[PDB]
mmCIF file of C-alpha atoms in Angstrom:
data_model
loop_
_atom_site.group_PDB
_atom_site.id
_atom_site.type_symbol
_atom_site.label_atom_id
_atom_site.label_comp_id
_atom_site.label_asym_id
_atom_site.label_seq_id
_atom_site.Cartn_x
_atom_site.Cartn_y
_atom_site.Cartn_z
ATOM 1 C CA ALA U 1053 125.569 106.853 111.863
ATOM 2 C CA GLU U 1054 125.284 103.328 110.020
ATOM 3 C CA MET U 1055 124.187 101.327 113.373
ATOM 4 C CA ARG U 1056 121.405 104.030 113.996
ATOM 5 C CA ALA U 1057 120.476 104.382 110.471
ATOM 6 C CA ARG U 1058 119.860 99.954 109.899
ATOM 7 C CA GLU U 1059 118.161 99.912 113.040
ATOM 8 C CA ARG U 1060 115.485 102.423 111.941
ATOM 9 C CA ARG U 1061 115.202 100.634 108.922
ATOM 10 C CA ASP U 1062 115.032 97.346 109.798
ATOM 11 C CA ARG U 1063 111.887 98.585 112.668
ATOM 12 C CA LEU U 1064 110.374 100.163 109.588
ATOM 13 C CA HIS U 1065 110.533 96.651 107.500
ATOM 14 C CA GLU U 1066 108.969 94.882 110.386
ATOM 15 C CA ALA U 1067 106.330 97.211 110.525
ATOM 16 C CA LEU U 1068 105.422 97.723 107.025
ATOM 17 C CA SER U 1069 105.256 93.705 106.848
ATOM 18 C CA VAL U 1070 102.756 93.499 109.674
ATOM 19 C CA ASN U 1071 100.700 96.177 107.945
ATOM 20 C CA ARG U 1072 100.397 94.522 104.389
ATOM 21 C CA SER U 1073 98.982 91.542 106.459
ATOM 22 C CA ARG U 1074 96.721 93.375 108.617
ATOM 23 C CA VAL U 1075 95.391 94.925 105.158
ATOM 24 C CA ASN U 1076 94.835 91.485 103.699
ATOM 25 C CA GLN U 1077 92.725 90.074 106.370
ATOM 26 C CA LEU U 1078 90.715 93.182 106.770
ATOM 27 C CA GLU U 1079 90.266 93.524 102.981
ATOM 28 C CA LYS U 1080 88.312 89.903 103.307
ATOM 29 C CA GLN U 1081 86.365 90.974 105.933
ATOM 30 C CA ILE U 1082 85.340 94.124 104.106
ATOM 31 C CA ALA U 1083 84.253 92.010 101.087
ATOM 32 C CA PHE U 1084 82.429 89.337 103.244
ATOM 33 C CA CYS U 1085 80.418 91.355 105.258
ATOM 34 C CA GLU U 1086 79.813 93.961 102.657
ATOM 35 C CA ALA U 1087 78.111 91.252 100.245
ATOM 36 C CA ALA D 1057 125.966 92.096 83.098
ATOM 37 C CA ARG D 1058 123.352 94.439 83.528
ATOM 38 C CA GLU D 1059 121.620 93.268 80.328
ATOM 39 C CA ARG D 1060 121.107 89.954 81.784
ATOM 40 C CA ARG D 1061 120.217 90.978 85.101
ATOM 41 C CA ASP D 1062 117.782 93.864 83.976
ATOM 42 C CA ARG D 1063 115.538 91.749 81.813
ATOM 43 C CA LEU D 1064 115.392 89.433 84.433
ATOM 44 C CA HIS D 1065 114.342 92.092 86.921
ATOM 45 C CA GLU D 1066 111.242 92.896 84.544
ATOM 46 C CA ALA D 1067 110.503 89.443 83.846
ATOM 47 C CA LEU D 1068 110.344 89.098 87.950
ATOM 48 C CA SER D 1069 107.988 92.078 87.681
ATOM 49 C CA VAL D 1070 105.777 90.425 85.246
ATOM 50 C CA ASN D 1071 105.302 87.578 86.616
ATOM 51 C CA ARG D 1072 104.735 88.917 89.956
ATOM 52 C CA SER D 1073 102.041 91.150 88.424
ATOM 53 C CA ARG D 1074 100.268 88.247 86.796
ATOM 54 C CA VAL D 1075 100.155 86.291 90.364
ATOM 55 C CA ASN D 1076 98.856 89.115 91.843
ATOM 56 C CA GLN D 1077 95.955 89.623 89.185
ATOM 57 C CA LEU D 1078 95.408 85.818 89.229
ATOM 58 C CA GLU D 1079 94.772 85.770 93.002
ATOM 59 C CA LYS D 1080 92.583 88.536 93.039
ATOM 60 C CA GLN D 1081 90.157 86.942 90.232
ATOM 61 C CA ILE D 1082 90.199 83.871 92.546
ATOM 62 C CA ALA D 1083 89.358 85.418 95.924
ATOM 63 C CA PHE D 1084 86.525 87.581 94.171
ATOM 64 C CA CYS D 1085 85.377 83.855 92.777
ATOM 65 C CA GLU D 1086 85.160 82.754 96.533
ATOM 66 C CA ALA D 1087 83.434 85.494 97.969
#
Protein backbone atom coordinates (compact mmCIF):
# COMPACT_ATOMS: atom_id res chain seq x y z
CA ALA A 1 0.00 0.00 0.00
CA GLU A 2 2.93 2.30 0.77
CA MET A 3 4.30 2.11 -2.78
CA ARG A 4 0.92 2.69 -4.45
CA ALA A 5 0.15 5.62 -2.14
CA ARG A 6 3.46 7.38 -2.74
CA GLU A 7 3.12 6.86 -6.51
CA ARG A 8 -0.37 8.40 -6.58
CA ARG A 9 0.71 11.36 -4.44
CA ASP A 10 3.79 12.04 -6.58
CA ARG A 11 1.74 12.06 -9.78
CA LEU A 12 -0.68 14.50 -8.14
CA HIS A 13 2.15 16.81 -7.03
CA GLU A 14 3.53 16.98 -10.57
CA ALA A 15 0.10 17.70 -12.02
CA LEU A 16 -0.45 20.50 -9.49
CA SER A 17 2.83 22.18 -10.43
CA VAL A 18 1.77 22.13 -14.08
CA ASN A 19 -1.63 23.58 -13.14
CA ARG A 20 -0.07 26.52 -11.31
CA SER A 21 2.17 27.34 -14.28
CA ARG A 22 -0.77 27.18 -16.69
CA VAL A 23 -2.87 29.46 -14.50
CA ASN A 24 -0.11 32.06 -14.33
CA GLN A 25 0.43 32.28 -18.09
CA LEU A 26 -3.29 32.31 -18.89
CA GLU A 27 -3.77 35.00 -16.23
CA LYS A 28 -1.25 37.18 -18.05
CA GLN A 29 -3.00 36.53 -21.36
CA ILE A 30 -6.40 37.40 -19.86
CA ALA A 31 -5.23 40.66 -18.31
CA PHE A 32 -3.37 41.83 -21.41
CA CYS A 33 -6.12 40.98 -23.89
CA GLU A 34 -8.90 42.47 -21.75
CA ALA A 35 -6.99 45.73 -21.46
CA ALA B 1 11.79 22.95 19.69
CA ARG B 2 8.18 23.56 18.68
CA GLU B 3 8.23 27.22 19.74
CA ARG B 4 11.21 28.01 17.48
CA ARG B 5 10.00 26.03 14.47
CA ASP B 6 6.46 27.44 14.80
CA ARG B 7 7.59 31.06 14.95
CA LEU B 8 9.78 30.23 11.96
CA HIS B 9 6.74 28.82 10.12
CA GLU B 10 4.67 31.95 10.67
CA ALA B 11 7.62 34.15 9.67
CA LEU B 12 7.91 32.13 6.45
CA SER B 13 4.21 32.58 5.74
CA VAL B 14 4.45 36.34 6.25
CA ASN B 15 7.49 36.66 3.97
CA ARG B 16 5.86 34.63 1.20
CA SER B 17 2.65 36.66 1.50
CA ARG B 18 4.65 39.87 1.11
CA VAL B 19 6.37 38.44 -1.97
CA ASN B 20 3.07 37.49 -3.60
CA GLN B 21 1.46 40.86 -2.83
CA LEU B 22 4.36 42.83 -4.30
CA GLU B 23 4.47 40.62 -7.41
CA LYS B 24 0.77 41.18 -8.06
CA GLN B 25 1.18 44.94 -7.73
CA ILE B 26 4.18 44.96 -10.08
CA ALA B 27 2.34 42.87 -12.69
CA PHE B 28 -0.53 45.36 -12.60
CA CYS B 29 1.97 48.18 -13.12
CA GLU B 30 3.46 46.35 -16.11
CA ALA B 31 0.13 45.92 -17.88
